[PDB]
């Protein structure tokens, strides 16, 4: 499992 970048959840 890879961790998402700090902004991966931003539109």
């Amino acid at each position, epitope marked *: 499992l890879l*961790e998402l970048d700090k*902004w991966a959840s931003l*539109w």
Partner: antibody
């Protein structure tokens, strides 16, 4: 307008601690979501991501080097430091620091991710050799 | 870590040529992909950010495309200062990773 410069020792002995400093101008680590990262390039090889720290003190390290790396910042001095412990000749490389934009903000509000997907300004780079 | 595969690893071309480099990701990274140009003895220079956005100040001859797992960088008209090494980088997952690079030399 943005300039970054790496400083540190050009030669270090195996098992020692390497401390690299990134001094910059043109931006503030107080800028919302801004990041300063470190990337190394060993002789004749590709770029290798090392770590990144953000305006909010959030930080990440390459998982395979996480036990030997520590990244810090001093927002009042426009500097970011990368410390690497127990170095070995495998660590010989040219080290670069680089700026990462925070997201587009409108009157303070973060409205777009786009700009953060890249390291837009890199320092000149410092070549560090590890040998006894 | 997320794997990026650049291709070709090496390419020979001539001034005025049109070249295209691709980068394939082991999995989707949405549009979080950047392209850089690196001249010998110099640091990387940003060309494209967020997969297809042209970095301010970069010549119009550079363009990028893709989203998900396939990406391409295109140089409409090769210029002398363009013979160098290019790298892709994904910033969707930690650790951020770079492709192996693509060197472009003067052909003969």
């Amino acid at each position: 307008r943005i300039t970054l410069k790496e400083s540190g020792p050009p030669l270090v002995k195996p098992t020692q601690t390497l401390t690299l400093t990134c001094s910059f101008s043109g931006f503030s680590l107080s800028d919302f979501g801004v990041g300063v990262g470190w990337i190394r390039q060993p002789p004749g090889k590709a770029l290798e991501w090392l770590a990144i720290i953000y305006s909010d003190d959030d930080k990440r390290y390459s998982p395979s080097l996480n036990t030997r790396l520590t990244i810090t910042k001093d927002t009042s001095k426009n500097q970011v430091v990368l410390v690497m412990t127990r170095v070995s000749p495998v660590d010989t490389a040219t080290y670069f620091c680089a700026h990462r934009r925070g997201p587009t903000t409108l009157f303070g509000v973060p409205i777009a991710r786009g700009p953060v997907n890249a390291m837009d300004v890199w320092g000149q780079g410092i070549t560090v050799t590890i040998s006894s | 870590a997320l794997q990026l595969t650049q291709s070709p690893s090496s390419l020979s071309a001539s001034v005025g040529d049109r070249i295209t480099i691709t980068c394939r990701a082991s999995q989707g990274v949405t549009s979080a992909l950047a392209w850089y140009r690196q001249k010998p003895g110099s640091p990387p220079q940003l060309l494209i950010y967020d997969a297809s956005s042209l970095e301010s100040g970069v010549p119009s001859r550079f363009s990028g495309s893709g989203s998900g797992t396939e990406f391409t960088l295109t140089i409409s008209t090769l210029r002398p200062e363009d013979f160098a090494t290019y790298y892709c980088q994904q910033l969707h997952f930690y650790p951020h990773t770079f492709g192996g690079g693509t060197r472009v030399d003067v052909r003969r």
